[PDB]
Amino acid sequence: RPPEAMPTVNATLRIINGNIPVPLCPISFRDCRGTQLGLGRHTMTPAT
Amino acid sequence: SHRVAFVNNFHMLMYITTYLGNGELPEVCINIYRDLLQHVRALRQTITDFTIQGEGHNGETSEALNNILTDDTFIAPILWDCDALIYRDEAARDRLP
Amino acid sequence: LLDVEATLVALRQQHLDRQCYFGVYVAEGTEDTLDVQMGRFMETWADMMPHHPHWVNEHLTILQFIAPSNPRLRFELNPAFDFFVAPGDVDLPGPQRPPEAMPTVNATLRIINGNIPVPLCPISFRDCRGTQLGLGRHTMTPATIKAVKDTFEDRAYPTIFYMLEAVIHGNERNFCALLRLLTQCIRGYWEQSHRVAFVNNFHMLMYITTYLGNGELPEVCINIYRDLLQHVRALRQTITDFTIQGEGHNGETSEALNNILTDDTFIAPILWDCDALIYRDEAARDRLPAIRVSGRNGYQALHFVDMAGHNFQRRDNVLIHGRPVRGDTGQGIPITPHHDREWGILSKIYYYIVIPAFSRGSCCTMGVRYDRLYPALQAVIVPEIPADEEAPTTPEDPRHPLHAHQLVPNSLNVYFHNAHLTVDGDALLTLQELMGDMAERTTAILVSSAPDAGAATATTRNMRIYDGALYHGLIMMAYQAYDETIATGTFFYPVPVNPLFACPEHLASLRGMTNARRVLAKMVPPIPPFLGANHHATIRQPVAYHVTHSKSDFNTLTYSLLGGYFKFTPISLTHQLR
Amino acid sequence: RVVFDPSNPTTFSVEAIAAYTPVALIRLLNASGPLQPGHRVDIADARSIYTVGAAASAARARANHNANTIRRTAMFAETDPMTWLRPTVGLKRTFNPRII
Amino acid sequence: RVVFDPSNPTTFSVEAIAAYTPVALIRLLNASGPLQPGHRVDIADARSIYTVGAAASAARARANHNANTIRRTAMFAETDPMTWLRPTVGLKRTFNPRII
């Protein structure tokens, strides 16, 4: 049961990259940065 | 139903391609598992490729500072064994655990 | 191109800080390979390494290698030599304890066109060379690819085959006294999971096609073997065009000078027999040759040792071979290699081209502990079959070799149970004819000879070329490190000798894989210097970078490792530039 | 039967019933007592004894299936106290136990 | 049984016994000798007994099969002083010569 403490601003380190809110790092850029990775890499064949 | 088994777990996914792989399971069914562990191992392989080798500091090495997944001070949302908690105490000694 | 006096003697004037004394210092071995791998190269290589790792960084690009801050940019001056800082006032390997002095720069000649570090002949050029070299040459179907690469990257390959090729050891006397069970297990791993068997020794792969491609297989499981053979032969044919005929000089004709895969003076990594030995002995008659068979200068060898001659734990300089198939057998032949040159030139094209493509680095050699391998071989439980009644084929038959009642733990008949194969009486009791050819001890060897006639001046032979190997051991597949019905490191043990097979994930089978060293095995390639070193050798980690990160389309890496196996030595230009 | 007996079963009477039989017997009766005779030991007591009791009642229900099968052996390394001179390989259990 | 002793098998006590017989008895016995009786002599010398006598331990349960098959011929040419006027060709072992 949270006490009746007055409001206050706090801060916490966004530990990883993906914590940046998406209206600052857009899905269309996320998936292109992902696609740059899987270049000549392994991918599951649709049968699987 | 052409529908594979033991996909909602990793231990269940792990306990098959080693032991149930000697030819007991149907090829076109077991090769799915044979592919998925390959996929998780190839997802681990790319972590090494996007980091520099040998720059560890204070317990946590290079690969323990780049990708939050590989680093041992992180935890999985399921705890079957107790080895992950032991491994977050072998390290994390100097991170006030 | 050998004019190096301006960089050798003018170099004992500048200053030299310290690096590791591992990848630049060489030693010798006298004991068996067991402890010198489990106890040596663990505690000293966790004291010599933890200060200033060196020479392994290859992630670099031609933009960062050339900036003024590169620690290596000072020691790279002539593309025909490998400059580095090493322990000085040493001219031989010596003991397993490095001496004390100020460092000193010894030299050595970069041999193959590939040893050029990665951010100078980038992988793009290195695998674009293939499409000019192999333009329309022998490509194989993709289904064989899907099969073989599966077999290689399999996390489930049974150890029955592992023990199988450590109990044949190449000689043909037993090779043909077991064939029923052998085709039966090849069918058992093919017709069950659609993956071929015995792909870990081109010895076996050249053995098989000539005695299983004529009826005792299916038409496809042997055609895959034929693919893997004829592609090797096509790569052997690819260099016939990259040579000029008419410069036979000093025993070695032009066919030997072009590629290192032809060079008889540098020995294959896994040879059981004495082929390239004698092919090389009439060579090197001006190339300062010397050998090291388990710490000893000379070597002895017998013709066939028996079971009553057990003595697995010998120490002397013996190098066993199977049997001379015919002729005389008593005090007659000191030594004869089996066949003509088509063996020692060809048995390593597979090793150095084909396996590195399918492996991509998913392989690691493993010396074999035999004092529990033949002990746990001669106790097969096979059902006697009634003189009148026929033999069974099903595992439900209470008198089939596989029935679920006759199961006695700690037996060889159970390896098939953990394998899901079929066996009978005519297949498993034909095993104990091995009392005529038995491999006692896996060993270690050091061989050296000067360069060929192309790099022979008064100041280059003092930069000799060392080569270490492991006789009568095994090159191994992907490891599990997650099995329990069988142990971790109780039968083999990793002795990483080639940078194609220096996996750290496979190093986890030695007793004592401490995590404080498991961090360094992930970066620095585990290589005992008495069996090979980084700069002083022919195959390198800057070359091994072309097999790991090259991300080829799986049909170009093979041909890419071919033109990258040509020499850059003043004579070696005389043909390649035409 | 034993619904009006406080903590008396306690894996001292449940073992008698078979495996096939008590599955029809638990769903036979309907009510607890009006004087809460089968309540003053909590349901986490009655069920705590009933689970192991049914485990036993099915444990001696398989006390006869032994001489029609083959025994359980060692499926792990579980190193032999006589490991020397002989490497001990575990047996994978996937076969058909039916011996005739 | 015979474990508390200095090299009693001695590549001798095994050709009397059938091949299948002893290998079951390993997981029967539990502990070794208390005085290290057969272990002061090299563990290697002890290992130099069973693996060199087992090819004769199996040779008798294979010497009962001897009268219900066909003896092999060599797998190579194996030049003979009488081979003239008939050329030698070798036989890869495939057949099922147990007499049925």
PDB file of C-alpha atoms in Angstrom, chain C residues 140-297:
ATOM      1  CA  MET C 140      26.784 -30.096 -57.007  1.00  0.00           C
ATOM      2  CA  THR C 141      23.037 -30.342 -56.437  1.00  0.00           C
ATOM      3  CA  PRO C 142      21.531 -28.496 -53.435  1.00  0.00           C
ATOM      4  CA  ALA C 143      19.853 -31.583 -51.949  1.00  0.00           C
ATOM      5  CA  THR C 144      23.229 -33.169 -51.250  1.00  0.00           C
ATOM      6  CA  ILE C 145      24.071 -29.844 -49.606  1.00  0.00           C
ATOM      7  CA  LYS C 146      20.937 -30.049 -47.457  1.00  0.00           C
ATOM      8  CA  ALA C 147      21.995 -33.557 -46.408  1.00  0.00           C
ATOM      9  CA  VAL C 148      25.713 -33.062 -45.756  1.00  0.00           C
ATOM     10  CA  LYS C 149      25.475 -29.686 -44.032  1.00  0.00           C
ATOM     11  CA  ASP C 150      22.756 -31.203 -41.841  1.00  0.00           C
ATOM     12  CA  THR C 151      25.096 -34.085 -40.985  1.00  0.00           C
ATOM     13  CA  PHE C 152      27.868 -31.638 -40.086  1.00  0.00           C
ATOM     14  CA  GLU C 153      25.772 -29.200 -38.056  1.00  0.00           C
ATOM     15  CA  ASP C 154      23.860 -32.061 -36.405  1.00  0.00           C
ATOM     16  CA  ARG C 155      23.644 -31.904 -32.602  1.00  0.00           C
ATOM     17  CA  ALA C 156      22.829 -35.633 -32.402  1.00  0.00           C
ATOM     18  CA  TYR C 157      25.484 -37.565 -34.363  1.00  0.00           C
ATOM     19  CA  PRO C 158      25.999 -40.889 -32.553  1.00  0.00           C
ATOM     20  CA  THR C 159      29.334 -41.754 -30.979  1.00  0.00           C
ATOM     21  CA  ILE C 160      29.031 -45.284 -32.392  1.00  0.00           C
ATOM     22  CA  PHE C 161      30.559 -43.986 -35.644  1.00  0.00           C
ATOM     23  CA  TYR C 162      33.184 -42.024 -33.691  1.00  0.00           C
ATOM     24  CA  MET C 163      34.386 -45.236 -32.082  1.00  0.00           C
ATOM     25  CA  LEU C 164      33.890 -46.985 -35.426  1.00  0.00           C
ATOM     26  CA  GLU C 165      36.562 -45.043 -37.305  1.00  0.00           C
ATOM     27  CA  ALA C 166      38.933 -45.161 -34.325  1.00  0.00           C
ATOM     28  CA  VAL C 167      38.711 -48.983 -34.520  1.00  0.00           C
ATOM     29  CA  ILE C 168      39.391 -49.286 -38.258  1.00  0.00           C
ATOM     30  CA  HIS C 169      42.471 -46.994 -38.449  1.00  0.00           C
ATOM     31  CA  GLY C 170      42.600 -47.229 -42.245  1.00  0.00           C
ATOM     32  CA  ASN C 171      44.247 -50.567 -43.068  1.00  0.00           C
ATOM     33  CA  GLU C 172      42.374 -52.857 -45.433  1.00  0.00           C
ATOM     34  CA  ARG C 173      42.916 -56.171 -43.612  1.00  0.00           C
ATOM     35  CA  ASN C 174      40.047 -55.513 -41.176  1.00  0.00           C
ATOM     36  CA  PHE C 175      38.420 -52.943 -43.478  1.00  0.00           C
ATOM     37  CA  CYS C 176      36.777 -55.832 -45.360  1.00  0.00           C
ATOM     38  CA  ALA C 177      36.030 -58.243 -42.489  1.00  0.00           C
ATOM     39  CA  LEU C 178      33.068 -56.200 -41.168  1.00  0.00           C
ATOM     40  CA  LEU C 179      31.281 -54.865 -44.263  1.00  0.00           C
ATOM     41  CA  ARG C 180      27.849 -56.351 -43.479  1.00  0.00           C
ATOM     42  CA  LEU C 181      27.459 -54.321 -40.281  1.00  0.00           C
ATOM     43  CA  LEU C 182      28.970 -51.252 -41.954  1.00  0.00           C
ATOM     44  CA  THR C 183      26.473 -51.016 -44.811  1.00  0.00           C
ATOM     45  CA  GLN C 184      23.798 -51.876 -42.249  1.00  0.00           C
ATOM     46  CA  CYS C 185      24.659 -48.850 -40.095  1.00  0.00           C
ATOM     47  CA  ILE C 186      25.103 -46.578 -43.122  1.00  0.00           C
ATOM     48  CA  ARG C 187      21.581 -47.591 -44.117  1.00  0.00           C
ATOM     49  CA  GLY C 188      20.564 -47.120 -40.488  1.00  0.00           C
ATOM     50  CA  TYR C 189      21.662 -43.503 -40.426  1.00  0.00           C
ATOM     51  CA  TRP C 190      20.599 -42.787 -44.018  1.00  0.00           C
ATOM     52  CA  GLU C 191      17.220 -44.511 -44.421  1.00  0.00           C
ATOM     53  CA  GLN C 192      16.191 -43.269 -40.954  1.00  0.00           C
ATOM     54  CA  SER C 193      17.107 -39.565 -40.911  1.00  0.00           C
ATOM     55  CA  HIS C 194      18.168 -39.097 -44.588  1.00  0.00           C
ATOM     56  CA  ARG C 195      21.785 -38.321 -43.631  1.00  0.00           C
ATOM     57  CA  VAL C 196      24.896 -40.106 -44.856  1.00  0.00           C
ATOM     58  CA  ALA C 197      27.467 -41.799 -42.617  1.00  0.00           C
ATOM     59  CA  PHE C 198      31.265 -41.711 -42.377  1.00  0.00           C
ATOM     60  CA  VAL C 199      31.933 -38.187 -43.649  1.00  0.00           C
ATOM     61  CA  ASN C 200      34.806 -37.522 -41.231  1.00  0.00           C
ATOM     62  CA  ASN C 201      37.719 -39.180 -43.053  1.00  0.00           C
ATOM     63  CA  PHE C 202      38.477 -38.935 -46.762  1.00  0.00           C
ATOM     64  CA  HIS C 203      40.372 -42.140 -46.051  1.00  0.00           C
ATOM     65  CA  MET C 204      36.978 -43.791 -45.511  1.00  0.00           C
ATOM     66  CA  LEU C 205      35.262 -41.772 -48.241  1.00  0.00           C
ATOM     67  CA  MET C 206      37.701 -42.954 -50.905  1.00  0.00           C
ATOM     68  CA  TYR C 207      37.556 -46.448 -49.390  1.00  0.00           C
ATOM     69  CA  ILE C 208      33.789 -46.758 -49.610  1.00  0.00           C
ATOM     70  CA  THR C 209      32.666 -45.770 -53.123  1.00  0.00           C
ATOM     71  CA  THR C 210      34.699 -48.666 -54.559  1.00  0.00           C
ATOM     72  CA  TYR C 211      33.027 -51.301 -52.370  1.00  0.00           C
ATOM     73  CA  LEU C 212      29.585 -49.898 -51.487  1.00  0.00           C
ATOM     74  CA  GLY C 213      28.779 -48.234 -54.819  1.00  0.00           C
ATOM     75  CA  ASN C 214      28.230 -51.704 -56.283  1.00  0.00           C
ATOM     76  CA  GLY C 215      25.037 -52.978 -54.675  1.00  0.00           C
ATOM     77  CA  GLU C 216      25.144 -52.835 -50.877  1.00  0.00           C
ATOM     78  CA  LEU C 217      23.683 -49.304 -50.677  1.00  0.00           C
ATOM     79  CA  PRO C 218      20.821 -47.320 -52.195  1.00  0.00           C
ATOM     80  CA  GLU C 219      21.468 -45.490 -55.453  1.00  0.00           C
ATOM     81  CA  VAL C 220      21.476 -42.104 -53.688  1.00  0.00           C
ATOM     82  CA  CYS C 221      23.369 -42.482 -50.382  1.00  0.00           C
ATOM     83  CA  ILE C 222      26.377 -43.544 -52.451  1.00  0.00           C
ATOM     84  CA  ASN C 223      25.837 -40.896 -55.128  1.00  0.00           C
ATOM     85  CA  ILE C 224      26.281 -38.310 -52.369  1.00  0.00           C
ATOM     86  CA  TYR C 225      29.622 -39.930 -51.558  1.00  0.00           C
ATOM     87  CA  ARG C 226      30.424 -39.707 -55.272  1.00  0.00           C
ATOM     88  CA  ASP C 227      29.479 -36.015 -55.307  1.00  0.00           C
ATOM     89  CA  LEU C 228      31.807 -35.340 -52.371  1.00  0.00           C
ATOM     90  CA  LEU C 229      34.565 -37.249 -54.188  1.00  0.00           C
ATOM     91  CA  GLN C 230      34.218 -35.888 -57.731  1.00  0.00           C
ATOM     92  CA  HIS C 231      34.024 -32.314 -56.476  1.00  0.00           C
ATOM     93  CA  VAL C 232      37.328 -32.898 -54.688  1.00  0.00           C
ATOM     94  CA  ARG C 233      38.784 -34.295 -57.910  1.00  0.00           C
ATOM     95  CA  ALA C 234      37.486 -31.252 -59.822  1.00  0.00           C
ATOM     96  CA  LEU C 235      39.361 -28.966 -57.443  1.00  0.00           C
ATOM     97  CA  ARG C 236      42.422 -31.154 -58.012  1.00  0.00           C
ATOM     98  CA  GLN C 237      41.838 -30.559 -61.738  1.00  0.00           C
ATOM     99  CA  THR C 238      41.428 -26.789 -61.246  1.00  0.00           C
ATOM    100  CA  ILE C 239      45.154 -26.373 -60.525  1.00  0.00           C
ATOM    101  CA  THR C 240      46.283 -28.410 -63.548  1.00  0.00           C
ATOM    102  CA  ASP C 241      45.382 -25.325 -65.595  1.00  0.00           C
ATOM    103  CA  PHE C 242      47.105 -22.986 -63.103  1.00  0.00           C
ATOM    104  CA  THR C 243      50.482 -24.621 -63.827  1.00  0.00           C
ATOM    105  CA  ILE C 244      53.060 -24.480 -66.621  1.00  0.00           C
ATOM    106  CA  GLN C 245      54.706 -27.749 -67.687  1.00  0.00           C
ATOM    107  CA  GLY C 246      58.461 -27.905 -68.273  1.00  0.00           C
ATOM    108  CA  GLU C 247      60.221 -26.764 -65.073  1.00  0.00           C
ATOM    109  CA  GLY C 248      61.014 -30.065 -63.387  1.00  0.00           C
ATOM    110  CA  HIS C 249      63.736 -29.074 -60.931  1.00  0.00           C
ATOM    111  CA  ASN C 250      65.102 -30.711 -57.757  1.00  0.00           C
ATOM    112  CA  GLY C 251      62.698 -33.615 -57.617  1.00  0.00           C
ATOM    113  CA  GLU C 252      59.715 -31.297 -57.382  1.00  0.00           C
ATOM    114  CA  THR C 253      58.170 -30.595 -60.777  1.00  0.00           C
ATOM    115  CA  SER C 254      56.005 -27.517 -61.416  1.00  0.00           C
ATOM    116  CA  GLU C 255      52.945 -29.455 -60.216  1.00  0.00           C
ATOM    117  CA  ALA C 256      54.333 -29.323 -56.667  1.00  0.00           C
ATOM    118  CA  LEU C 257      55.362 -25.647 -56.555  1.00  0.00           C
ATOM    119  CA  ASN C 258      51.988 -24.067 -57.338  1.00  0.00           C
ATOM    120  CA  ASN C 259      49.657 -25.151 -54.523  1.00  0.00           C
ATOM    121  CA  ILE C 260      50.504 -26.096 -50.951  1.00  0.00           C
ATOM    122  CA  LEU C 261      47.878 -28.860 -51.207  1.00  0.00           C
ATOM    123  CA  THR C 262      50.389 -30.487 -53.593  1.00  0.00           C
ATOM    124  CA  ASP C 263      53.446 -29.735 -51.411  1.00  0.00           C
ATOM    125  CA  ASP C 264      54.774 -33.077 -50.130  1.00  0.00           C
ATOM    126  CA  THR C 265      57.246 -31.206 -47.872  1.00  0.00           C
ATOM    127  CA  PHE C 266      54.381 -29.965 -45.666  1.00  0.00           C
ATOM    128  CA  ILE C 267      52.536 -32.927 -44.188  1.00  0.00           C
ATOM    129  CA  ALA C 268      48.774 -33.453 -44.104  1.00  0.00           C
ATOM    130  CA  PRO C 269      47.065 -32.844 -40.739  1.00  0.00           C
ATOM    131  CA  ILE C 270      45.642 -36.358 -40.145  1.00  0.00           C
ATOM    132  CA  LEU C 271      47.719 -39.122 -41.765  1.00  0.00           C
ATOM    133  CA  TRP C 272      47.610 -42.613 -40.302  1.00  0.00           C
ATOM    134  CA  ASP C 273      50.064 -44.078 -42.817  1.00  0.00           C
ATOM    135  CA  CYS C 274      53.593 -43.306 -44.036  1.00  0.00           C
ATOM    136  CA  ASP C 275      52.789 -42.011 -47.527  1.00  0.00           C
ATOM    137  CA  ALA C 276      53.799 -38.330 -47.600  1.00  0.00           C
ATOM    138  CA  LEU C 277      56.673 -39.231 -45.281  1.00  0.00           C
ATOM    139  CA  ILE C 278      58.435 -41.202 -48.028  1.00  0.00           C
ATOM    140  CA  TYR C 279      57.020 -38.976 -50.796  1.00  0.00           C
ATOM    141  CA  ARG C 280      58.838 -36.161 -48.959  1.00  0.00           C
ATOM    142  CA  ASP C 281      62.004 -38.050 -47.978  1.00  0.00           C
ATOM    143  CA  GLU C 282      63.447 -38.024 -51.502  1.00  0.00           C
ATOM    144  CA  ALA C 283      62.356 -34.407 -51.445  1.00  0.00           C
ATOM    145  CA  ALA C 284      63.938 -31.873 -49.083  1.00  0.00           C
ATOM    146  CA  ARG C 285      67.379 -33.294 -49.876  1.00  0.00           C
ATOM    147  CA  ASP C 286      68.477 -29.642 -49.882  1.00  0.00           C
ATOM    148  CA  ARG C 287      65.686 -28.412 -47.572  1.00  0.00           C
ATOM    149  CA  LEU C 288      67.162 -29.050 -44.070  1.00  0.00           C
ATOM    150  CA  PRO C 289      64.580 -31.635 -42.934  1.00  0.00           C
ATOM    151  CA  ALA C 290      64.109 -32.927 -39.392  1.00  0.00           C
ATOM    152  CA  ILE C 291      61.351 -34.788 -37.520  1.00  0.00           C
ATOM    153  CA  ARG C 292      60.188 -35.084 -33.897  1.00  0.00           C
ATOM    154  CA  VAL C 293      58.296 -38.274 -32.986  1.00  0.00           C
ATOM    155  CA  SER C 294      57.334 -37.906 -29.299  1.00  0.00           C
ATOM    156  CA  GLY C 295      60.397 -35.942 -28.209  1.00  0.00           C
ATOM    157  CA  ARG C 296      62.757 -38.302 -30.049  1.00  0.00           C
ATOM    158  CA  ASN C 297      64.994 -37.662 -33.047  1.00  0.00           C
TER     159      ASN C 297
END
